[PDB]
């Protein structure tokens, strides 16, 4: 069977919240079968526990925020993308502050931390959610859609309001094999335009931003000394974001996501619309990994 996965070992990181500028201590702890990904704030008493689920999303401005009462965990999208990409089912994420650290602005550092700690296969079938029918949300010219697909595929188009490298649009389609995430998506950094960033900074937002954790685009050219990691790093980063939001379903998807200008807010609306449309999906397991539509890397 395709088995659930957790971490072999506890692993620890430190970093800064890009939004908050706060120093945060991050601990990833192994968890047992059918735990899911569960966030908790170690700096509160009592400690509060928030499953990484669509129903616990409270804010979607610039990032996905988990909320339970007045306790928040901000910027979950990059870490959840790493845990989706590697097929982690079960883990505790323990934070000393209200925001996941930004690291280098990609999922790369999280993937390496997880893959260092090692993956542990567990004696329980991994659960998948199979898209059996098309489900779409729109807001003006923005679109997000789930369509049936025997595997996992993301198609994404961004549409800037001015040309960047001579075009307003950037498109990528990734049909995921076991290695696609690590090779072609995980290293894609977050980005902003210099005028947007200066405005955000003025409003006391993006207090942990730097060239070390974000691509800065000064109108139509990249400011960062060493340039881009991928030709279309920007759309690859939006694919990373969508993968992190998708994992809030709490099980791995069999199907295709297609986004046109779809950010955390519309991605979250698509999740809620899919969940409400129960005839469009079904939970499934694969007792034979060899006949499954998805395969993960060896543990
Ligand atoms: C979780 S990130 C999010 C998208 N997002 N939301 N807010 C963001 C802010 C930034 C930033 C920035 C930044 C600020 C200051 C500097 C330094 N200065 C520059 C040059 O001049 C002087 C020195 C550098 C860079 C980048 C991405 C952002 N996201 O991907 C959600 O998914
Ligand atoms: Zn992002």
For residue 173, report the phi and psi dihedrals to the nearest 5 degrees: -120, 120
CB burial readout 129-160, b (16+ within 10 A) else e? bbbbeebebeeeebbbbbeebeebbbbbbbeb
Nearest ligand 1 atom to the CA of 19 is: 7
Cis peptide before 46 (omega within 30 of 0): yes
- Among residues 212, 281, 204, 296, the alpha carbon closest in space to that of 246 is found at 281
Whether 156 contacts 239, CB under 8 Å: yes
Experimental determination approach used: X-ray
Whether 208 contacts 17, CB under 8 Å: yes
Probe ligand 1: pick from 60, 73, 190, max atoms within 8 Å of CB? Answer: 190
CA of 220 from ligand 1 middle (Å) equals 16
Known catalytic residue at 19: no
Structure's resolution in angstroms: 1.9
Atom 31 of ligand 1, residue of closest alpha carbon: 63
Q: How far apart are alpha carbons 259 and 262 in whole angstroms?
A: 5
Atom 2 of ligand 1, residue of closest alpha carbon: 190
Question: What are the extents of the domains in the chain?
Answer: 1-127, 128-299
> Which stretch of DSSP H or E encloses residue 270?
helix 264-276
Secondary structure tally for the chain: helices H, strands E? 6, 20
What is the CA 199 to chain-centroid distance, rounded?
A: 25
CA of 288 from ligand 2 middle (Å) equals 35
Name the catalytic one among 5, 19, 236, 264: 264
């Amino acid at each position: 069977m395709i088995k659930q996965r957790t971490l072999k070992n506890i692993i620890r990181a430190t970093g800064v919240g890009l939004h908050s500028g706060e120093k945060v201590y991050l601990t990833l702890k192994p968890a047992p079968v059918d735990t899911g990904i569960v966030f908790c704030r170690t700096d509160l008493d009592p400690v509060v526990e928030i499953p990484a689920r669509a129903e616990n999303v409270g804010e979607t401005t610039m990032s996905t925020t988990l909320v339970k009462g007045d306790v928040k965990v901000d910027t979950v999208e990059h870490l959840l993308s790493a845990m989706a990409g590697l097929g982690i089912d079960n883990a505790y994420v323990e934070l000393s502050a209200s925001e996941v650290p930004i690291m280098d602005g990609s999922a790369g550092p999280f993937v390496f931390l997880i893959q260092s700690a090692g993956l542990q296969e567990q004696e329980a079938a991994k659960k998948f959610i199979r898209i059996k029918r098309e489900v779409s949300v729109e807001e003006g010219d923005k679109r997000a859609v789930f369509v049936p697909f025997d595997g996992f595929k993301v198609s994404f188009e961004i549409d800037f309001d001015h040309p960047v490298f001579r075009g307003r649009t950037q498109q990528a389609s990734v049909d995921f094999s076991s290695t696609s995430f690590v090779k072609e998506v995980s290293r894609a950094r977050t980005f902003g335009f210099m005028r947007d960033i200066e405005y955000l900074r003025s409003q006391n937002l993006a207090l942990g931003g730097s060239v070390e954790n974000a691509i800065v685009v000064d109108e139509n050219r990249v400011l960062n000394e060493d340039g881009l990691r991928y030709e279309d790093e920007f759309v690859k980063h939006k694919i990373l974001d969508a993968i992190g939001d998708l994992y809030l379903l709490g099980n791995s998807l069999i199907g295709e996501f297609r986004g046109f200008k779809s950010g955390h807010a519309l991605n979250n609306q698509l999740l809620r619309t899919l969940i409400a449309d129960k005839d469009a999906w079904e939970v499934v397991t694969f007792e034979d990994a060899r006949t499954a539509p998805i395969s993960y890397m060896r543990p």
